[PDB]
Amino acid sequence: MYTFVVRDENSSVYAEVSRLLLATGQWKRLRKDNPRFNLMLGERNRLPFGRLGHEPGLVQLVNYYRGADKLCRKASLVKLIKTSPELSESCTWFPESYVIYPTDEREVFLAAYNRRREGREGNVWIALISSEASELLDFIDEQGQVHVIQKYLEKPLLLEPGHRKFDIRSWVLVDHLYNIYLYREGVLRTSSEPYNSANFQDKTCHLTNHCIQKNYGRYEEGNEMFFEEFNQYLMDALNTTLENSILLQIKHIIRSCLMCIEPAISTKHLHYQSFQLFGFDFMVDEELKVWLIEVNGAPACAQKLYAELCQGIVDVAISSVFPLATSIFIKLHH
Amino acid sequence: MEVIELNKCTSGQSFEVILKPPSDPSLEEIQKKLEAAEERRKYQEAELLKHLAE
Amino acid sequence: MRECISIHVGQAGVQIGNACWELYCLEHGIQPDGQMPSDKTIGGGDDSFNTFFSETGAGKHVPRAVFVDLEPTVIDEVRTGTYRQLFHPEQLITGKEDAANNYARGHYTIGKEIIDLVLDRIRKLADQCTGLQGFLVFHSFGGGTGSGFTSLLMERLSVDYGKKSKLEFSIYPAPQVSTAVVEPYNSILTTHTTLEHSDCAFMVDNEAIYDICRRNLDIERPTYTNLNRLISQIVSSITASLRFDGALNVDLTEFQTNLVPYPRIHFPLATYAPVISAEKAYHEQLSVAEITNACFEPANQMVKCDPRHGKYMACCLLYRGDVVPKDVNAAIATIKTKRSIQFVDWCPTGFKVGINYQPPTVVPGGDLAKVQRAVCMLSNTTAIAEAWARLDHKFDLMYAKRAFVHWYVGEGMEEGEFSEAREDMAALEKDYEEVGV
Amino acid sequence: REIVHIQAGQCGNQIGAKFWEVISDEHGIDPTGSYHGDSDLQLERINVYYNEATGNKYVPRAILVDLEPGTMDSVRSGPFGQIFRPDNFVFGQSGAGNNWAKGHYTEGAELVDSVLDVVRKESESCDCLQGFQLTHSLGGGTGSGMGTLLISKIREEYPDRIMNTFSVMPSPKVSDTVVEPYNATLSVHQLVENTDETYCIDNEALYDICFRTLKLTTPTYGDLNHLVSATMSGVTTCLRFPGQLNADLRKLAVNMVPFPRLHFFMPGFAPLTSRGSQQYRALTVPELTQQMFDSKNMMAACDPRHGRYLTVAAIFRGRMSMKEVDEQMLNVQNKNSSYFVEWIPNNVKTAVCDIPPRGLKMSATFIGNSTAIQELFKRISEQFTAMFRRKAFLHWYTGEGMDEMEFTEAESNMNDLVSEYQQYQDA
């Protein structure tokens, strides 16, 4: 009979998890500030890792990896990839990006830009989307935050029927043993209105966020296409499968990113242990080449997959540590 | 990389290896504090004995 | 040669003092009766071990140390211990009634009645010094004496010995080995009052020492004897440079220079390896690379925390046994390629190494196995602030309800000193953060 | 570090006598006062309760008080009757008639100075007196009235000394007279002010235990006192025997009492035993822990589930796996952390002594500072008001010079004590 606490109630994912735990009748929820817990569903900001693993006779576990923010924040991600030999500046699956600070690496970004003057070579960048630096670097001084500038992929793979843009979301679970588990079910957050490569002010057809579009729901319910359909499309349209054309690259990128920061965040020989659910966002160009967009440290799930995914978390990340009285995951071996 | 300040002797040796370069109260103040706390133990004790006297 | 005086305050300080001086004698070949056949300069000398020992014309080598406790039971075991002849009666000061785990009682009430006596007995040693460096002060955070009287003593030493340095060996409170609840109060209170009176303080969490004794020495439930003999080994590693020939950390001033850039942030993290059980039948001796790599495992640290998520300001490696600079540099080179070691931008990323060819001496019949090589790393990492965070949280929980406060107020202390001390700790935690991220 | 013992009244002297009977056996002291044991751990802390009298004999640092000679004559002719110093027998003749006023204001006032002379003579002999302890009932006249009078005058002459009590609470289940709630309410008023620790020994609980658990058809005061002496031996174990626990009464008080007025403890003991009926099956450590936390072994008829523990202390005795002790102790907390306040970190502490009590090869003594103790005072307050609203039986008191106002005040302070416990139960 184990105990746990909840310190982020805006978490749609772990709200489902806390519920499932209670339903087993072998887990009891405590208050926010009760330290005598076995599990902690902690907050997103300033989680007190320093106070974990100091309760005698209590094996403590937390649903967040300390230091994982370096991967799950755009400014840190670019810095991580460029400075890490494991990934390097010659990274093939990450769009070239640069860190820009308001009034740093700005004069360097121009070096690549000064060459783009060659012409006949696509030149559009994102923070929003524009074709020239002058206006790009003029609005990043108008919010006051630290923003990243990245090469916009001008020739994305476009779904038919519709001529639509789309991004892929993969959910990855890393347990206490740092086993990397890819959820077999992903989702395509697609565009409903056709992709217009002319001008990029109208960001309804370019930004494929589930919220921005809320022609919604024309093709697929909720503007969300899942792997079974998307796979069938690739077979019929492009004479290939999802596993071959895209997923091998996805599995490669996920495995490369986490293995890189493993020595920095691993809780192998620590006095407390950690697991965490990640949300990798990918992008496919017209030549079936996968690109990494970003990583989410506190991802939300698709409505259909909440039940299956959340149950999976309890199985391999919680019950693995706290046992009770075929798998929906793909283990990325290393 | 760079080893420096190497000093050797019979009992052992010491050195330094660099990998990358960079980028009170007075005595009276004390005894006033202590005595300021003593008078308060005596005030508290006085009010106790007063209370017990009533 | 410059002398060093050791001050042991409270039960923890005294009993650890015993473990250390016991070990020192075995290392320097000094006998329980205080005789040292090795020393040919009878009745005096200019040697390195004279830093911790003075000599009598009769050839006895006496510790430059003073034991102080507000209750006699612990020090009484020194008076009748195996090293009873070693010490001088005036070096052992005992009260009648302890501080009852009350900082205010140790500091104000009882402290006032014995502080002058202690300073007088300390002055008797300082007069026998040709050039006193300063003091090494052993005590617990938790005890009323170890916390209360120590802070008072540290204040007076800064008045009567302004130019002299002062180092701390402080026992951080752990529920595993404590029947006290008010420890968080005493720790915050004594840290606040002592902070600017201490140049360098080595904290030791009983939690860490406890688990090391269970994990590595296979001791089911460590006693204080088990903890202390392990602690004494660490302390020995840290003070070895003051008692032997060398060029690294030869005086107390050099501890501040090499480990403490910022005065307030003067709490270096200690990490020790290897810890091997004497009851371990078969043991494969560990190499320089293996023991050095172990200095970056949290399980070997004197305080459990995660240096990966902080920044280093300094780092010293202190080896004892079969070690040469070659194998050390080779070890460092490998370790950095695989581990997270961030230094603050305004510091050089490097290590000050010290080696003593004589391997670590072990207490006969003790729990530790003899080894061919051992190492103690002294790294000033911001990650040690986790220990302050834990402590300050426990403090805030109790003080929000003013629990147990009446005990302190009843001894003449102001409730305001609680908030003053807590404010200081809040500033300290933020100082660590500015440097750390 | 010596402790001066006082026992006042019938109840106080009878539980006190058995207390000395029990620990005198543990320390190997015979009724004559001569040591006859095997271990020497029985002696290196025997100065706490015994003065080493001339002729190689140990004499209890105990003072026996009463306003009638009846009970004290029984002590003197009891098993360990001679062990006590004859000069320390201080008694009157008139009695107290179960009247708090007589014990506190008239009959007792006449005798109290005589008692203090004996307290003084004992204290002056102490190298370093660590505190006083009193055994008494709160339902009678002498132990209740004169006891709280003594406490008041000891605090006057020794204001910086620890003053604790082992106080027997009255219950209708085991009642001598109807005015027991009056005497109890008046006494609690005193204990809240002038003691550091009061071990609440409820006769209701002692009766229930003897009947429900121990299966005794009609328990006597002797049966009730087997539980008291065993508990008292338990809480004093770490004071009387050497161990890694280096604490005097003051240090123990600091760690157990977070608020000065809330110092009323629930004692407990395991395994529960009938006198004479000895034990064959030794309890496993899990069983000791489970029982001492169960309400059925509590000596204060309070349900700890109706409140929250501020602090808890547990003294295990006998040879056992101290690892297993921890694991089981750490288990109770981690199972029911809702009944422990979260704003006092690590408020459950444990100790082990190698020497078990007689008859048992291992045992556990429970000391709980629970807010549930308010149920005890609530009970007394109900019984109090039931009579006081009609001013019943009050003439016994006003006849001794007391005014109704003093009853109203005493009632108010105890109702405040209840509201205080309720404050932290909601924190």
Ligand SMILES: Nc1nc2c(ncn2[C@@H]2O[C@H](COP(=O)(O)OP(=O)(O)OP(=O)(O)O)[C@@H](O)[C@H]2O)c(=O)[nH]1
């Ligand atoms: N490592 C270690 N810690 C100890 C030892 N003795 C006591 N402690 C710790 O010290 C804390 C309690 O303070 P003490 O040193 O026992 O008390 P004190 O300094 O004598 O002060 P008083 O309250 O007057 O007794 C607890 O957290 C103990 O764990 C010891 O021998 N070794």
Ligand SMILES: Nc1ncnc2c1ncn2[C@@H]1O[C@H](COP(=O)(O)OP(=O)(O)CP(=O)(O)O)[C@@H](O)[C@H]1O
């Ligand atoms: N370099 C690039 N080329 C093309 N499209 C890009 C791009 N970078 C981002 N996008 C598009 O912009 C959209 C929003 O980008 P981004 O991922 O930064 O938003 P976000 O903060 O919402 C990630 P999440 O919602 O998962 O936390 C993506 O869905 C993708 O369509």
Ligand SMILES: Nc1nc2c(ncn2[C@@H]2O[C@H](COP(=O)(O)OP(=O)(O)O)[C@@H](O)[C@H]2O)c(=O)[nH]1
């Ligand atoms: N446990 C116990 N309680 C007693 C004993 N004698 C009396 N009492 C209780 O104490 C109250 C009577 O007080 P008593 O000691 O006789 O009064 P006193 O002699 O004038 O101080 C009643 O509530 C009894 O239940 C006894 O021997 N043991």
Ligand SMILES: CCN(CC)c1ccc(NC(=O)c2cc3scnc3[nH]2)cc1
């Ligand atoms: C501090 C936690 N522990 C267990 C480690 C503990 C141990 C013993 C006691 N005993 C007493 O407080 C007491 C004994 C007597 S005799 C007269 N008054 C008293 N008071 C309390 C707590």
Ligand SMILES: [Ca+2]
């Ligand atoms: Ca010499």
Ligand SMILES: [Mg+2]
């Ligand atoms: Mg002490």
Ligand SMILES: [Mg+2]
């Ligand atoms: Mg009677």
Ligand code: NA
């Ligand atoms: Na007199």
